[PDB]
Design a protein around this nucleic acid. Structure first.
Ligand SMILES: [Ca+2]
Ligand SMILES: [Ca+2]
Ligand SMILES: [Ca+2]
Length: 288
DNA sequence: GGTCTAAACGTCGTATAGGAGCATTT
DNA sequence: CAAATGCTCCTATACGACGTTTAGAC
C-alpha cells in the first residue's frame, strides 16, 4: 500500500483542480458549472494511478495518448476533499485547492444554480489556475477575482511527501562534460535535481534544509541541485532508499544509484569505465 | 602546472498543464 | 425535462534532461 503523504506530495507536484464553466441554454443563469480533480502521467507510469485508486477507494482511470485518474462526481470529489484536508498541500497549489474547495461546496448545496452563486463561483475560477477565458470575460465583466491565501510558512510535513514530490518532478541524471583538463577527456558527475518556478522558493529552500544538502539556484524557474558526491552517497541516496521513488523513475534511480557507486570507486577515470558509464547513461531517462 | 570536484552556466523538445465540450446516465 | 457526470479531444509552454565553462582545492 502507498503512503498517503506520497500521494499528497505527488499531487502537490503534478495534479490540477479545475472548474469548467460552459454556456448552457437549459439553465436559468445560462451557464453550466462543474468541478474536476485530475492526475496525468505518461502511459508507462499507469501503475501509480492504480496505486492511488486503491488507497483512496475512488477514482476513474483511463489510458489513451496519456494515463489519467479523474474525479468528477460529487461523491468521488468528496473522497478527494477528505484526503487533502487530512494531508494538506504545500506548493502554491494549496491556494488553488482552497479556491476549489469553496467552489466545490457552493456546487454541493446547489447554489451554483443561482445568479448569485454562479457569480461567486466565477470569482474563484478567475484566480484559479489560468483565470477566466476570453469567452468568460465577455460574458461576465466587472468580476473581481477572489483573494488567494498565500501559503508561505509551510514546512516539509513528512519524508514520504518528498518521495512523492520527486517521483513526479525530481530528476536523477548523469552529467558528462567533454573537458580536456581531465585524463579521460570527460568530467563525470552524478546530479540530483528538483525544479520549481520561483513562486515557491520557501519550499525549495526548506527542502535543502530537510535533506540538509544541495543548492538553490535562480534561472524564470529555480533549481535545487545536488552534485556533491558525498552528499549524494551519504545523504540523498539513503533518503530515497527508505522513502521510495515510485514509477519508472525508480528504475532510472537504480541506474543512477549504480553509476554513483562506480564513480565512488574512481572507475570513471578510465576510458573503459567512461565507456561503461555512457552505456548506462544512454539507457536512462529519455534514453529508454 | 595538472587533475580533479563543485558548481555556475547554457539550451531545446515534449510530457504534461490546463483546458473545452459532446454524449450518456441519473 | 434538467442536472449531473461520463467520456474525449485539443494546444502550447514550463519544465526535465542534456551539454559547456569556471572557481578553486590539492
Ligand atoms: Ca508542477
Ligand atoms: Ca511537470
Ligand atoms: Ca512527471
Amino acid at each position: 500500500n502507498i503512503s498517503p503523504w506520497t500521494i499528497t506530495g505527488f499531487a502537490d507536484a503534478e495534479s490540477s483542480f479545475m472548474l469548467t464553466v460552459s454556456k448552457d441554454s437549459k439553465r436559468n443563469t445560462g451557464w453550466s458549472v462543474r468541478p474536476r480533480f485530475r492526475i496525468g502521467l505518461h502511459n508507462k507510469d499507469v501503475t501509480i494511478l492504480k496505486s492511488i485508486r486503491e488507497y483512496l477507494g475512488a477514482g476513474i482511470i483511463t489510458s489513451d495518448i496519456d494515463a489519467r485518474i479523474r474525479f468528477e462526481s460529487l461523491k468521488e470529489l468528496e473522497v478527494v476533499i477528505n484526503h487533502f484536508d487530512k494531508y494538506p498541500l504545500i506548493t502554491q497549489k494549496r491556494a488553488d485547492y482552497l479556491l476549489f474547495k469553496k467552489a466545490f461546496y457552493l456546487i454541493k448545496n446547489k447554489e451554483h444554480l443561482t445568479e448569485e452563486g454562479l457569480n461567486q463561483i466565477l470569482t474563484l475560477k478567475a484566480s484559479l489556475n489560468l483565470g477566466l477565458s476570453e469567452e468568460l470575460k465577455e460574458a461576465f465583466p466587472n468580476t473581481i477575482p477572489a483573494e488567494r491565501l498565500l501559503v508561505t510558512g509551510q514546512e516539509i510535513p513528512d519524508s514520504n511527501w518528498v518521495a512523492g514530490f520527486t517521483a513526479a518532478e525530481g530528476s536523477f541524471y548523469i552529467r558528462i562534460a567533454k573537458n580536456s583538463t581531465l585524463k579521460t577527456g570527460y568530467q563525470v558527475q552524478s546530479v540530483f535535481q528538483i525544479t520549481q518556478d520561483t513562486r515557491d522558493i520557501e519550499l525549495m529552500k526548506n527542502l535543502i534544509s530537510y535533506l540538509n544538502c544541495g543548492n538553490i539556484r535562480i534561472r524564470t524557474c529555480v533549481d535545487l541541485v545536488v552534485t556533491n558526491l558525498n552528499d549524494i552517497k551519504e545523504k540523498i541516496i539513503p533518503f530515497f532508499n527508505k522513502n521510495h521513488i515510485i514509477g519508472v523513475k525508480l528504475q532510472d534511480y537504480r541506474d543512477w544509484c549504480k553509476v554513483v557507486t562506480l564513480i565512488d570507486n574512481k572507475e570513471h577515470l578510465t576510458s573503459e569505465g567512461l565507456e561503461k558509464i555512457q552505456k548506462i547513461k544512454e539507457g536512462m531517462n529519455r534514453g529508454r
